[PDB]
Subunit: 251 residues, 4 copies
């Protein structure tokens, strides 16, 4: 209760899975939230399921769309006042090795997972710096930002990029006294309706050779670390990686 009082958050890809749980817990903790998705059927349903428009709204946006990022911040500040918190959560995956990644697949995935995170982080710094907001940018950067997977080549590139680009941003903001922190969150495998629709994936993901806890996580597992990072509780944390993975990377 009240851990995000006063905060105004944008969460990209906030209508389902991890993003939706982040939104839910943020609203529970007193934040105002703008969620996005590139679609609208999903997004408008999503917001009302969490709360009332004074708490949470939807804005249609593809995170790879540079110009839209500006539309999104403007819409958020007009609904709720100056943005304090950005969660760059939107992402896609391609199930290909590096060897077999088409150039089109490469470019598409980097547009969302890398360019989108760059656009959001760059704009977030510009919009949030020097306002006494206790501003926090939280970039979703995966267990696949620490370890490779033979069938996630482009995804691995994007997540490693986000991991280290976020440190650069953290340092500049710290050195310049901007009152903006930048950190990454690295989920292991999490169970969502989308995973449930992939036959065998959860089981495959729950083998002890993958996730030592022998099961995968839930969306709220990622929501709670994001609450910590958005809150002023984490005012000395910047430039670091927060892993919530059931032990995946510990072995």
């Amino acid at each position: 209760s009240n851990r995000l009082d006063g905060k105004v958050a944008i969460i990209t890809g906030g209508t389902l899975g991890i993003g939706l749980a982040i939104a839910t817990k943020f609203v529970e903790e007193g934040a105002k939230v703008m969620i996005t998705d590139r679609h609208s059927d999903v997004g408008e349903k999503a917001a009302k399921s969490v709360g009332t428009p004074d708490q949470i709204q939807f804005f249609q946006h593809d995170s790879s769309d540079e110009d839209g990022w500006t539309k999104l911040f403007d819409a958020t500040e007009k609904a709720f006042g100056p943005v304090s918190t950005l969660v760059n959560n939107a992402g896609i995956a391609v199930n290909k090795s590096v060897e077999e990644t088409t150039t089109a697949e490469w470019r598409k995935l980097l547009a969302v997972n890398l360019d989108g995170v760059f656009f959001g982080t760059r704009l977030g710094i510009q919009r949030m710096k020097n306002k006494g907001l206790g501003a926090s940018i939280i970039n979703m950067s995966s267990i696949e930002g620490f370890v490779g997977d033979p069938s996630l080549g482009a995804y691995n590139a994007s997540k490693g990029a986000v991991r280290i680009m976020s440190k650069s941003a953290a340092l500049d903001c710290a050195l310049k006294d901007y009152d903006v922190r930048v950190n990454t969150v690295h989920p292991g495998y999490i169970k969502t309706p989308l995973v449930d629709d992939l036959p065998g994936a959860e089981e495959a993901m729950s083998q002890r050779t993958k996730t030592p806890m022998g099961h995968i996580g839930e969306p709220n597992d990622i929501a709670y670390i994001c609450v910590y990072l958005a809150s002023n509780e984490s005012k000395f944390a910047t430039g670091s990686e927060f892993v919530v993975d059931g032990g995946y990377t510990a072995q």
Copy 2:
């Protein structure tokens, strides 16, 4: 409020600095707490300053004392019921390079910082496993578990040891379904009364080449990450490292 309802925690070195703030926030969040120190003058004063005996008590113990560790768990369970949470926070430092570390200094520091953490972790697993407690062992493992410092040789050894031993314990507990998580917390430099008594240390620590944020942290910065790790909010986090360092390790 209520984030640690029902929890019963031991915090070693809990009478001052980071340990005391961990204790304070744990009690605020509903945990019962036993704090320790090798002394008693410090420890008894400390507990009453946080709360009443039904909330927090003191037990005299040197974490290097293997037999005492057993006394400590027994005293905690008799005061508050079965222990769910252990914070291995007690530690010492020697201001010596590897080159100049005496063997006596080496052994003394390893006894507290390494053996003590081993004794606590081993006993904690044995006492906490298989009770449905949502048990959590939180080992204090430093920025000096990631990077070296030329004048902290033995300290660096101990912190690197804790970092990886904790992963071993996390994995075994996960694989065996023990309902015990093990994680490490890695503070950067934190401002305490002890640091205040070391002329020039905070300033030295606040240079941008050391801490990018240009200042050092406060004890509550470490308390809040410990609340997250002790709580069931972090039920999917095991075997990982949580860094709160003002950017120190990001550059």
Copy 3:
């Protein structure tokens, strides 16, 4: 002597600095080498300075040019026989924070440093797999793939991407028995004619707060780790990072 007997190597950006030293030592150790640069004035001079055309040749190529990558492998195999070794060394830097990185700067740097390395790695796997060559892909991935720098935002993104994408490729090649290894090399600061032309850079780079050894490296420092990685001496090394940095990342 003879440590790369029989090997056929492509080195991108091989006409100056680190690339030229890699080429020089590779030829000394018995490899045949094709060096590249996006220019030709630099490239043709470079090759003759190292050896005769039966040892080393130049091919004009911008590593961001996908179609050219195919031209480059074909020219190398026609000069020297099937390629066994690829060093993805070409790279550029932008001296900008994330905050101030223009989109054009972002795209240009990613085209060379990320897309170029992807194109080379993908093609290298396809061309080298399953030929008994003891094939090795060596991706230049920087100290800036481990730590951030506030004024190298895009560069940091690219180097973190290369670091982890390389692990993906390593794993797929290992799992599929391709006889291709993939590793990254992470130079600290190295002294070259280009650094010499940047007033104050070497000195700035030699401060103990940057490079503990108190001086920067030389091109051969990177050449020698590349010889090891190209040779069959390193037949069990894949998916890992080889840092040669004067202590930069150790503190």
Copy 4:
């Protein structure tokens, strides 16, 4: 050939497995070598199998024996002149979880794997600093210094300790211009006569979920990275970790 001309090396645990291969390649490259083992039957046989006494000798020593370390350096300098190179390779393992590690097991393993490496490193710095030798200390610090194993708790503690203590030593030596480098080598699983005597271990170790290359390494895989680190080829490498693991830690 000649890559270690002039060097004088001590290799602890140099009579079998990885240590013996390190010794063999060191002698091949022109170094003079003193190997150790706590036994003598093994050690005297070992040296003659590699070369003549002017190339390689044996000295009986348990690396946990502090006073003996001094005897060992003196015997080496009297045979071969001032020591330039130290490989802290002796180590033992206990097949126990943290939970089940007896205190006696803990102390015994730390005495060899941690205290022994401390004693060697401390003495090596003192004996080697400031002599223009191009001195190099190479500490064997395992894949189990990066990841945990549920059944190697004490071993994991020791290897994490060595990993970070070595960075401390590297930094002090660099900052003080000692002409001593300190680095760690991290083998994955390697096939030796001892592994061959453990039924099922190699197979278990070769599963793709353990070692992606699908087989384990050979002793020379570790010897060759040690040659690089002992040689002046690696004069800019200090404070870093060199992993040769078949991909184990990349996934």
